[PDB]
Design a protein around this ligand. Structure first.
Ligand SMILES: CS(=O)(=O)N(Cc1cccs1)C1CC1
Lengths: 300, 237
């Protein structure tokens, strides 16, 4: 069980850790989050009380270093930093735990939600989507645009998701125009899986990371990427059976976790209706179709 | 974006453009079978690809053999249209290739866009105009070459005959669309108007009769009367 200490909390802020969140008052004696499960990536995220604009946060994995949060009054945000002095860190954490100035990562033992949402998400892949090589953790916020969005403008602050475009030469073999547009299996299996992602685990990892950035930061380009990656599978007639079964589980837990009141903006009607009722895979996503119909029947 | 009443003169500027109409590509007769079920029999069709500035008509005849053994023919027809338009563009010298292709039906947008990915600078556009190009098979010489085809064939026509010697391309297009709108609303009456007078003939190298300027005004008047009437005979007014 690992710990992310906070130097202090000088401004009133709602702090999220994975799917949990709590309010911290201005100058409240808050010194971090303990009992963070080892073995998963995590995200710690922030929404200031004065400016609900800019949700922002940090993806990290406690196995890769000792990380803490410190407010910067010049840049006006809570920053993640790495502490290289392991003894200074252990000493800080132990003092803050003794004074009980930390919240406990509040995981219910039965609860596999976070695992299910991050099963294929790896830090090393996050750090290639979010390029900032001098840090072991990755900053994301509501406003960052994706590489594909920048083609249709600061490249250093971009989300380098894999570009998916159904009306592109990459997607369409000369001479198979109709075939490849109506059945995207060659683009899914040869171009993306064999060629770019190498395996379905890396594909699912990027799909899961895009969803989580959409949900936690309202990041619009991430939502676009999540839906594009779903639609590319659903629009393929030939998909390995293990991938379809795993996709159904992935999406089930994403739909389960999505705040009811954000479904209007985070869910694309066309994609979901096409995927569940018109696509090749209309009959292959039983769990996802059942939760969607009971939780968001309006969308459909 | 879409082509409509507001941007109508764009058709007659000096940027090469083509209309593509696919409404006569896949054509069938519906009939009963011996068992009393219904079946279709395909007949020859055509792609109607028209330069509205010059009158240049690239009539690609679609022979029924292209449908043999194929499924979902109405969907295939759109992709076959886009394949043939793309092949036509590639066959033209660079300086004759269109800058825009305007499709008369929105369902042709994705098929044509995908087939033209090699040509990113050619704009594929819809239109809000309700153009009467489906009635092209009411022009006797066009219908004749389509029905006689025994194999795939491209035939080149000028749909304005020699009108551009005397009128502008805006006026020629307005005449064409009036004639075709008439033929579409009431083919028999329209064709009666055009041929009632035996002294006005169709030149061997033309599609329409050799009317004088004064006779075209009378003809055009008779076509507008027809269209308004039928619009009464239809809606009763
Ligand atoms: C009769 S014409 O002069 O206008 N013409 C030119 C054309 C090129 C493409 C369609 S028609 C025919 C000889 C071909």
């Amino acid at each position: 069980m690992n710990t992310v200490p906070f130097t202090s909390a000088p401004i009133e802020v709602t702090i999220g850790i994975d799917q949990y969140s709590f309010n911290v008052k201005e100058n409240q004696p808050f010194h971090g989050i303990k009992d963070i499960p080892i073995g998963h990536v995590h995200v710690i995220h922030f929404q200031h009380a004065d400016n609900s604009s800019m949700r922002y946060g940090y993806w990290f994995d406690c196995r890769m270093g000792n990380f803490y949060i410190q407010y910067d009054p010049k840049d006006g945000l809570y920053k993640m930093m790495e502490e290289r002095d392991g003894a200074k860190f252990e000493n800080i954490v132990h003092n803050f735990k003794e004074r009980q100035m930390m919240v406990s990562y509040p995981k219910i033992d039965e609860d596999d939600t976070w695992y299910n949402l991050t099963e294929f998400v790896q830090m090393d892949k996050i750090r290639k989507i979010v390029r900032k090589d001098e840090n072991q953790f990755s900053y994301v916020d509501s406003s960052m645009t994706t590489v594909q969005e920048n083609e249709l403008s600061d490249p250093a602050h971009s989300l380098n998701y894999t570009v998916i475009n159904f009306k592109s030469r990459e997607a369409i073999r000369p001479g198979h125009e109709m075939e490849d547009f109506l059945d995207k299996s060659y683009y899914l299996n040869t171009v993306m899986l064999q060629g770019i992602f190498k395996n379905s685990s890396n594909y699912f990892g990027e799909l899961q990371f895009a969803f989580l950035n959409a949900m936690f930061f309202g990041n619009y380009g991430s939502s676009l990427q999540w839906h594009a990656m779903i639609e590319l599978i659903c629009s393929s007639a030939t998909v390995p059976k293990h991938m379809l079964d795993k996709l159904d589980e992935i999406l089930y837990y994403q739909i389960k976790t999505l705040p009811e009141q954000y479904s209007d903006i985070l869910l694309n009607e066309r994609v979901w209706n096409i995927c569940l009722y018109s696509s090749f895979q209309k009959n292959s996503l039983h769990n996802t179709e059942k939760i969607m119909e009971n939780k968001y029947p309006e969308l459909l | 974006g879409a082509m409509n009443s507001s941007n109508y003169a764009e058709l007659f500027n000096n940027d090469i453009k083509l209309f593509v109409d696919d409404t006569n590509v896949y054509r069938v007769t519906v009939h009963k079978t011996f068992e009393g079920n219904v079946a279709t029999k395909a007949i020859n069709g055509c792609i109607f690809t028209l330069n509205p500035k010059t009158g240049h008509l690239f009539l690609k005849i679609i022979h029924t053999s292209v449908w043999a053994g194929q499924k979902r023919l109405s969907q295939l027809a759109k992709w076959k249209t886009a394949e043939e338009v793309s092949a036509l563009v590639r066959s033209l010298p660079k300086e004759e290739q269109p800058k825009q292709i305007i499709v008369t039906r929105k369902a042709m947008l994705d098929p044509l866009e995908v087939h033209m990915l090699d040509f990113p600078n050619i704009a594929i556009r819809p239109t809000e105009l309700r153009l009467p190009f489906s009635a092209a098979m009411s022009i006797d010489k066009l219908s004749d070459v389509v029905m006689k085809a025994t194999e795939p064939q491209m035939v080149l026509f000028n749909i304005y005959d020699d009108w551009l010697d005397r009128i502008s391309s805006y006026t020629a297009f307005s005449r064409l669309t009036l004639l075709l709108r008439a033929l579409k609303t009431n083919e028999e009456s329209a064709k009666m108007i055009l041929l009632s007078d035996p002294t006005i003939t169709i030149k061997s190298y033309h599609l329409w009769p050799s009317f004088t300027d004064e006779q075209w005004i009378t003809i055009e008047s008779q076509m507008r009367d027809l269209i308004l009437t039928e619009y009464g005979r239809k809606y009763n007014v």
